[PDB]
Design a protein around this nucleic acid. Structure first.
Ligand SMILES: [Mn+2]
Ligand SMILES: [Mn+2]
Ligand SMILES: [Mn+2]
Ligand SMILES: [Mn+2]
Ligand SMILES: [Mn+2]
Ligand SMILES: [Mn+2]
Ligand SMILES: [N+]
Ligand SMILES: [N+]
Ligand SMILES: [Zn+2]
Ligand SMILES: [Zn+2]
Lengths: 184, 368, 368, 184
DNA sequence: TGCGAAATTCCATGACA
DNA sequence: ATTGTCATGGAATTTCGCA
DNA sequence: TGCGAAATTCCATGACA
DNA sequence: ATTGTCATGGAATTTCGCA
């Protein structure tokens, strides 16, 4: 078998609904399997059309051989199937209720969910503007298993934004009490 | 004047006036018999006025002014007096064209890494497509890899919105642009300082300086035109296709596509190159590091036979930017304060402000 | 196709496919092991489609299209098939630029006599001066002697009014102009036929062809600009001064003013030349006849290293005159009917009309 | 003494009033002394200002050393004197009631007056348009004394409009009777 | 150790402003 | 305080296939 | 049959479209 | 059925003034 490469496989999923931010409610999440590189796209719905609209942006930069997803409605529609067939992208579904990705991908999704919740607090409504910085953080985060960040693996260089202060990622005392206050 | 000319009539020798010719008085004026004919020798005190009257008929240069004068007069070293006046005639100095070419172009080093330097610029206005009129083009200097954004205006605000999307991927050390309103605004400056991005500006009115992106505009427009043949110019929906198409096109001189230069491996697009299928990613990234360093780099071309290079303290003139009808194409003379490189200078524009300026928008002032 | 490729798998020799390489079957396709790697050999019947798909990604030329194909395939003489398709791709043919220069310019003979040929043209619009916006410029081809008329429009009617005044002096054999609306109208044609004047037109969109007068426009504007420095652009009252000033200015290469070339003697203007004071008029006219014939005439410059010259029956393309945004800069290919001279041709514009056209507005169609 | 030259001397005079033609009533007449070359300018009055306006056109082509005229008001005004002084043109007046020019010039003026009257008949009103052709005729007319036309002497070449049919110039029977009819 | 043809490299030309 | 660039397709040069 | 300086000629550069 | 041109000012080359 040939070694794993960037663009071999993109793992996609929806997160949300979230509180409204500049009209957006969801985040489509794309993680390259080999590098762990993440792209995020705000959407108004977890629909096929929001998915296609977002993936059209990404697939103007790079096209994956395989897209992997759960069996969400957005990804199993025949429109989404027609879309992938048109681009020579093979679709791949985890069996229902049994999400399988990979260790590296699993951890990344955990990081994403946790990192979002962290800053989604105190400013539940301003996350749209924060998506850029969230991605830079996620992509310039050192990988314990590999000696390298996703940025390094994707581009083959150091980046001009290393996130040297590997952050807490856990919720402080004021945030737990005001996350229990917002969800009241 | 009357003093110098007197010693001459009595037949004694003055430096400048050849002794082998005969000088006489006639009709109240000192004359001389020269091969071409008999010419009047005016007194030195009359000569500036004469050169001036001859020059002023049509504001002629050296020879054409001389030829008028030589019709009536002779004196020593006439051209020297002609040239003295040309060098002081404001109207000629700011209206005439140059006849010296710029020194040969620089070929700045290719940025060493992707994201070291971005070149940005606007194309448009274009026939309206979905309400959009412009395209922001962002070109990575090392790779050529290019991003395209449709906008409604070439504004700061639309620049910022698109760059926020692009910088999601990576932040660049430097962003180079021309002195367009969108890029020189204080809002855009804050936006860059906020992010550790250094703004680099072209000298004014010198798009060769943004050559990397200007040249990419040509490819963008050329492909858009081809895809739109015999259809209405609905370009909005094709930006994404064109972006992908160009990022995956080979440069014959490099033997690489910009995509390859950025990632060291083709993605799932037609005719993907497969040579590194058996290498590990790490082996691939190591071969890419080697590929990046050994790319062909052009060398500075030969000077043309009549070029000038700037020298500190030289009088030079900046080209007028948008000269009105029937107005001079050149500013008043100004002085070279510093030679930044042989193609770029700081001048004191005699107001006097410091301006950094390309020699392509300069002529050397004539007649010293 | 399947026939030709079969004889190959069994190890027998086909012309084109080198015998020293080993050809096998795998994954349902004929393959070959080449230095660069293992490539698929498509059947001849698949090859046009492949070249086409590769070319169509970004409508790339020879090498950049080849490099895509060579990623997956090998077959004999691939570039030959690539070039076959480029030569048939309408979109590339009418959008790409030329990379061959025009042959070296002609230097037509100077008209032998004053009044043999006039070159006429309009300057403007100019900032309004006394309600006037344009200048008619009429240049005598032999002498350079120039007449100036202010007009409200570049119209036939204003042309006729000024030429009636000028032709009071003398009628010219020929009047040369560009294809401006003022000169191509049937009214202007009648006006010329009425007088025994032959109309000669430049090829379209080629002002080099009216070079004599275009060049004079430069001097006219340049002197007007100088005289108007730091004053409002009230040019109307200066036309007469400029006309006189330029007609009496020396050309350094000729050593004569246009006035001198027309009359063989200066009039009462400053610095009048006096060399023929002792000759009779008739002696003067005889020396002028001799001066007229021996004027310097420039010779055709060297061809550039990569020029083309038109050949009868060649496919060539005319440049689109005023191409819209995102539209091709070239017309569909057309055929050279006649080579009038090495810089001028008649083409069948495949509608098909006969057009007489400068090679500067032509490219030779690529890939034969 | 040096031989006579074109531009040595221009002889000017007014002819008129004439019947109105496109608003014009007079003709300023300029004849170069050496060549016999004629220029004609329509004016609305025999005034200094009409003279200056017309001579400004001519003197944009060529400047005479001397202008000769009778002592008409237009030519003796101090404005006209200032005008000539400005251009280095010396003015020259014939003594009152004794017009003297030269044989060549005298004959030319006769030709002009006669040629005008000839075509001024039958169309007393359309002479404005005819001034160009009148001048070409006058200037491509052979000079008995010299072997040459004014055109030939001025430009040193043959012209493209030779007036080979040296014309009658006298008034026919129909014209005499209709000149006696117009002047009724 | 050399030949004819094919492949590759060279590079002037022009277009982005 | 900064700086030209590079797709294109004939021609020139190099390499390949074969002896 | 020669030298230093002045005069003249050469000619690339750019601007008219 | 038509076609580049020529002012400009440094440099290159020729001529002049003198022995
Ligand atoms: Mn899901
Ligand atoms: Mn720009
Ligand atoms: Mn024109
Ligand atoms: Mn009178
Ligand atoms: Mn631009
Ligand atoms: Mn023009
Ligand atoms: N550099
Ligand atoms: N010719
Ligand atoms: Zn001047
Ligand atoms: Zn094409």
């Amino acid at each position: 078998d040939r070694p794993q490469k960037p663009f071999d496989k993109f793992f996609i999923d929806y997160i949300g609904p979230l509180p409204p931010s500049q009209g957006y409610l969801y985040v489509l999440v794309v993680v390259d399997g080999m590098t762990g590189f993440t792209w995020l796209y705000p959407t108004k719905a977890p629909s096929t059309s929001a998915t296609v609209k977002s993936l059209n942006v990404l697939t103007s930069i790079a096209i994956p051989k395989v897209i992997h997803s759960d069996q969400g409605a957005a990804f199993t529609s025949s429109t989404f199937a027609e879309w992938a067939k048109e681009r020579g992208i093979h679709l791949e579904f985890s069996t229902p209720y049994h999400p399988q990705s990979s260790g590296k991908v699993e951890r990344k999704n955990s990081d994403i969910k946790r990192l979002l919740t962290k800053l989604l607090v105190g400013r539940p409504t301003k996350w749209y503007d924060l998506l850029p910085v969230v991605q830079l953080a996620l992509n310039n985060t050192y990988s314990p298993v590999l000696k390298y960040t996703p940025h390094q693996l994707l581009f083959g260089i150091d980046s001009n934004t290393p996130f040297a202060n590997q952050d807490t990622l856990d919720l402080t005392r004021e945030e737990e009490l005001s996350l229990l206050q917002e969800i009241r | 004047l009357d003093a110098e000319l007197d010693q001459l009539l009595q037949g004694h020798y003055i430096k400048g006036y050849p002794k082998q010719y005969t000088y006489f008085l006639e009709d109240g004026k000192v004359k001389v018999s020269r091969p071409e004919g008999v010419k009047i020798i005016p007194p030195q005190s009359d000569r500036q006025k004469i050169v001036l009257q001859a020059h002023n008929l049509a504001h002629t240069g050296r020879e054409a002014t001389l030829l008028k004068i030589a019709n009536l007069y002779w004196w020593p070293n006439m051209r020297k007096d002609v040239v003295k006046q040309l060098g002081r005639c404001q109207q000629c100095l700011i209206t005439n064209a140059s006849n010296k070419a710029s020194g040969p172009i620089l070929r700045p080093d290719r940025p060493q890494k992707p994201f070291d330097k971005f070149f940005i610029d606007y194309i448009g206005p274009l026939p309206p497509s979905q309400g959009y009129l412009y395209v922001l083009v962002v070109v990575d200097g090392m790779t050529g890899f290019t991003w395209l954004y449709p906008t409604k205006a070439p504004s700061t605000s639309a620049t910022v919105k698109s760059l926020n999307v692009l910088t999601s991927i990576a932040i660049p050390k430097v962003i180079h642009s021309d002195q367009g309103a969108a890029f020189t605004s204080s809002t855009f400056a804050e936006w860059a300082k906020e992010r550790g991005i250094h703004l680099e500006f072209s000298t004014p009115y010198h798009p060769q300086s943004s050559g990397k992106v200007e040249r990419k505009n040509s490819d963008i427009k050329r492909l858009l035109t081809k895809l739109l043949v015999g259809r209405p110019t609905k370009w909005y929906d094709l930006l994404p296709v064109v972006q992908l198409a160009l990022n995956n096109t080979y440069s014959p001189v490099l033997k690489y596509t910009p995509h390859q230069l950025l990632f060291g491996i083709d993605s799932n697009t037609p005719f993907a190159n497969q040579d590194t299928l058996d290498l590990t990613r790490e082996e691939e990234l190591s071969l890419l590091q080697e590929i990046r360093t050994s790319l062909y780099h052009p060398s500075t071309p030969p000077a043309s036979s009549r070029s000038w290079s700037p020298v500190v303290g030289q009088l030079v003139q900046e080209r007028v930017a948008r000269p009105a009808s029937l107005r001079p194409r050149w500013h008043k003379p100004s002085t070279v304060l510093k030679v930044l490189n042989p193609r770029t200078v700081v001048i004191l524009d005699h107001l006097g402000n410091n301006r950094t300026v390309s020699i392509d928008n300069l002529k050397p002032t004539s007649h010293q």
